[PDB]
Write a protein that binds this DNA or RNA. Structure first.
Lengths: 107, 97, 50
RNA sequence: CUGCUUCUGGGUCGGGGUUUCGUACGUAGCAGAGCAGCUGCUGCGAUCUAUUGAAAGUCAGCCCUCGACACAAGGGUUUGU
RNA sequence: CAUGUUGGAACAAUGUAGGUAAGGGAAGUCGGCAAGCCGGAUCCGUAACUUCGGGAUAAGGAUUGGCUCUAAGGGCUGGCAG
RNA sequence: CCGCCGCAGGUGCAGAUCUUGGUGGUAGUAGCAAAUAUUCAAACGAGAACUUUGAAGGCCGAAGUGGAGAAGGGUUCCAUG
């Protein structure tokens, strides 16, 4: 019902378009957080360190155009925020994003 | 909470910079109540505070490039900035002869 | 500097021991009028002479 | 200035179309100044040729999807002759 | 080391600091101011004038990558070997 | 503390770009723009853009933002709160 895990590919290239060279990789982290908030409706998003490294792999100016992201709504653990559930945004290494749909994986 | 004391000490015991001292992020509380060097020397041996290895500066392509220079590649007219004298002076030749 | 004279180091020694706050049993006295130590001497702000 | 269910609508991703650049990596070759090493096979070699108008990007303020994937009848503040 | 005593969101005018511009080319302007050209090395070539030292990197040209060879320039042990 | 009768004066303020102190409008305005840059999780904690740790990305690039001193400073050192 709520504890859902679903795959997405995020076109960062058209969420990052026009923004300055010293704010492309930092911006890209916010439209994976804005993206995570939009689909899996939790104002609490917590993004993985491996997914950070993937965005900063080509430095700050150059960012991967398309990225593959497993998005997982989990229950929020004790010391509860007003948010009852959070999203864990984990990286999925992909060779080519060609003919990749948004996959509803199961646990 | 605060580990600035025990990155300075550890660096002064390991004889590296605090650039290289690896304080165990999951064992934060065991490092924070060391408060002295005798207690840090335990936490070197017990494998918490670890000396990170040197960031690799390989001169493998340098060696590979210089083996082309020994053959006389990258040594044409468009790779000479300094004069015939500045590159290999006449007095040093006349000395050799 | 590091290189000091015994007269200057004695001068600095006095100006350290004068640079402490009031004891908090002094304001519980009868004819008490002292709130804080007015002659407290910080090392950025006032430069001690010399 | 617009959109927020005619059982449908926008969003996202994918695919098309468009278009930009100019032929990807790998692999193969009796192609390659040669040179080294083995008695014609074997290394090294920029480059060239084929695969390959290939590869890559393409709305973020490009075009068409009817293909996946969720999501969408909700919240807030006010207003009476 | 953590951007120099702050962040976030935008990307208007006017700035400040960098660029680029078709065709013309100083017509701009007090005035080529600012900008731009030129620029390293190697090989040629170098005028007036000169106090014979200079002028001089005058001026003016050609060349420059990558690869793959060829030749030349040496130590050391017993006109040649190792 | 004051009325009346005398006495005495450092005896009456709006000003002097007066003196001292206080408070306005401007105004929640100008501003917080020199030397490329931050980002992710976690910890402590009432509280994190700034602390600490880890991982990443960068900078100084040995005529350094590095390691030591002299002048000068004088406790700024170090720990803990």
């Amino acid at each position: 019902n709520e504890v859902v895990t679903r795959e997405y590919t995020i076109n960062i290239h058209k969420r990052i378009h026009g923004v300055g060279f010293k704010k492309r990789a930092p911006r890209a982290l916010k439209e994976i957080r804005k993206f995570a908030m939009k689909e899996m409706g939790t104002p609490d998003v917590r993004i993985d360190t491996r997914l950070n490294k993937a965005v900063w792999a080509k430095g700050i100016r150059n960012v991967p155009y398309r990225i593959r992201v497993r998005l997982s709504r989990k229950r929020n653990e004790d010391e509860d925020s007003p948010n009852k559930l959070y999203t864990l945004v984990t990286y999925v290494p992909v060779t080519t994003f060609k003919n990749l749909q948004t996959v509803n994986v199961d646990e | 909470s605060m580990l600035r004391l025990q990155k300075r000490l550890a660096s002064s015991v390991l004889r590296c910079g605090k650039k290289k001292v690896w304080l165990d992020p999951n064992e934060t509380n065991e490092i924070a109540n060391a408060n002295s060097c005798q207690q840090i020397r335990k936490l070197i041996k017990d494998g918490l505070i670890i000396r990170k290895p040197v960031t690799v500066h390989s001169r493998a392509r340098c060696q590979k490039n210089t083996l082309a220079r020994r053959k006389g590649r990258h040594m044409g007219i468009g790779k000479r900035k300094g004069t015939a004298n500045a590159r290999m002076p006449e007095k040093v030749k006349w000395m050799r002869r | 500097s590091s290189h000091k004279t015994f007269r200057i180091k004695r001068f600095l020694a006095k100006k350290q021991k004068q640079n402490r706050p009031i004891p908090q049993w002094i304001w519980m006295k009868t004819g008490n009028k002292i709130r804080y130590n007015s002659k407290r001497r910080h090392w950025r702000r006032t430069k001690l002479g010399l």
